[PDB]
Swiss-Prot record:
Entry note: thermal dependence: Optimum temperature is 80 degrees Celsius.
Protein name in the entry: Cellobiose 2-epimerase
Repressor recorded as keyword: no
Comment on pH dependence: Optimum pH is 6.3.
One Pfam family here: GlcNAc_2-epim
Keyword annotations from UniProtKB, A to Z: Isomerase
Source organism (scientific name): Rhodothermus marinus (Rhodothermus obamensis)
Catalyzed reaction equations: D-cellobiose = beta-D-glucosyl-(1->4)-D-mannopyranose
SUPFAM superfamilies noted in UniProt: Six-hairpin glycosidases
Length: 407
């Protein structure tokens, strides 16, 4: 009694997503971004497509490049992707990894010299996430050892054992800072959904390749924290910022993070095999997906950016909430069987193809205005890597493969 799209449609979508990933996204990253002056990858590519090999380079961007090529190599086998992942890995261990105090720096100069040596938990998480994926792709022992060491540092210097969760930023020598903001957009509060979501994401990937008992408990504690403090059942949205005891300190809504969390929380519980926790997580996950469906979308099916603290709807289409909606809506279809979620996934994909991707200049536009005009934003920068859109394509391809197997 499944309602399932016909084989033609599933295959057509899968083919389009694969083409987008391999002929647009990964092609751009493999050809435009490698830097033969300093090694590794450039920190910025402007709106005109020009790479800037002298720009400062962020740990998050570089971890994202490692993760994406590693995951693409694992799933698709293409030797170029392993080559590109190795390139990212080598630069990362050489320059981002602090061999003295452990963990990864926030930002280095193009030549590898540390510029911003803070140890932000968000960056530590992305390091764990990428290193564990590289291990999953290659069996590399050093990558897994490094991921384990960073996990140990987060738990040692950042874990709040009284209230749950984590202090989010420390200095180079792991002493806590007051200002844990990832960027100027962010509220100056001690706890954020965003950082905790990516600790969860990282820990789930680590557990998959290293199923340590204590890690399972830390991951479960994070899932339980989301269910108890972060997810808001009255509205179907995540609360974004908090004090140390998880009292809400924000009323803003992020549609992209809602739909991202919707599928990542289920990935995390499934990695654990925690059958007792799953029903509650699925309920919250489906709610986040429905809330996004009903409140976060334009008539074209694309996702708006946020409702701000004063209530203003930011109608810009940023690239990453569209990617996250592709996976989150397909996931919601898989979980619920409700084909309206598949239709929503199809609609966001059509938007991605018709509006978000940049056919002229390659990759995807960072932002498109409500009237359809692309903003002249950078194509690659500190916060724009190949991870959200690359992962979204990889996830969709695999999910559509499973759906095709129901026949
Ligand atoms: Cl990204």
């Amino acid at each position: 009694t499944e309602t399932i799209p016909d084989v033609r449609r599933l295959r057509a979508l899968q083919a389009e997503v694969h083409e987008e990933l391999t002929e647009n996204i990964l092609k751009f990253w493999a050809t435009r971004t490698h830097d033969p002056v300093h090694g590794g990858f450039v920190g910025r590519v402007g709106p005109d497509g020009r790479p800037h090999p002298e720009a400062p380079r962020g740990a998050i961007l570089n971890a994202r490049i490692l993760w994406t090529f590693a995951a693409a190599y694992r799933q698709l086998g293409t030797p170029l992707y392993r080559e590109m992942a190795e390139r990212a890995y080598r630069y990362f261990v050489r320059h981002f990894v602090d061999a003295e105090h452990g963990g990864v720096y926030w930002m280095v100069a193009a030549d590898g010299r540390p510029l911003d040596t803070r140890k932000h938990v968000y960056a530590q998480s992305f390091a764990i996430y990428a290193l564990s994926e590289w291990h999953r792709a290659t069996g590399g022992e050093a990558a897994l050892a490094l991921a384990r060491s960073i996990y140990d540092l987060i738990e040692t210097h950042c874990a709040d054992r009284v209230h749950g969760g984590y202090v989010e930023a420390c200095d180079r020598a792991w002493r806590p800072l007051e200002d844990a903001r990832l960027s100027a957009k962010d509220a100056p509060e001690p706890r954020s959904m965003n950082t905790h979501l990516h600790v969860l994401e990282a820990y789930a990937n680590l557990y998959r390749v290293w199923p340590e008992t204590e890690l399972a408990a830390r991951l479960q504690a994070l899932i339980e924290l989301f269910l108890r403090a972060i997810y808001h059942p009255a509205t179907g949205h995540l609360i974004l910022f908090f004090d140390e005891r998880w009292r809400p300190r924000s009323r803003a809504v992020s549609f992209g993070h809602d739909i991202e969390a919707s599928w990542l929380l289920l990935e995390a519980v499934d990695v654990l095999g925690q059958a007792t926790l799953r029903p509650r997580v699925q309920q919250a996950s489906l709610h986040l997906a429905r809330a996004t469906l009903a409140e976060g979308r334009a008539p074209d099916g694309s996702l708006y950016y946020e409702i701000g603290e004063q209530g203003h709807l930011d109608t810009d289409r940023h690239w990453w909430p569209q990617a996250e909606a592709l996976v989150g809506f397909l996931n919601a279809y898989q979980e619920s069987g409700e084909v309206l979620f598949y239709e929503a996934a199809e609609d966001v994909w059509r938007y991605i193809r018709e509006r978000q991707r940049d056919t002229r200049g390659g990759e995807w536009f960072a932002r498109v205005r409500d009237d359809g005009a692309p903003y002249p934003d950078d194509k690659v920068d500190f916060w724009k890597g190949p991870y959200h859109n690359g992962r979204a394509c990889l996830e969709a391809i695999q999910r559509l493969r499973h759906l095709l197997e129901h026949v």
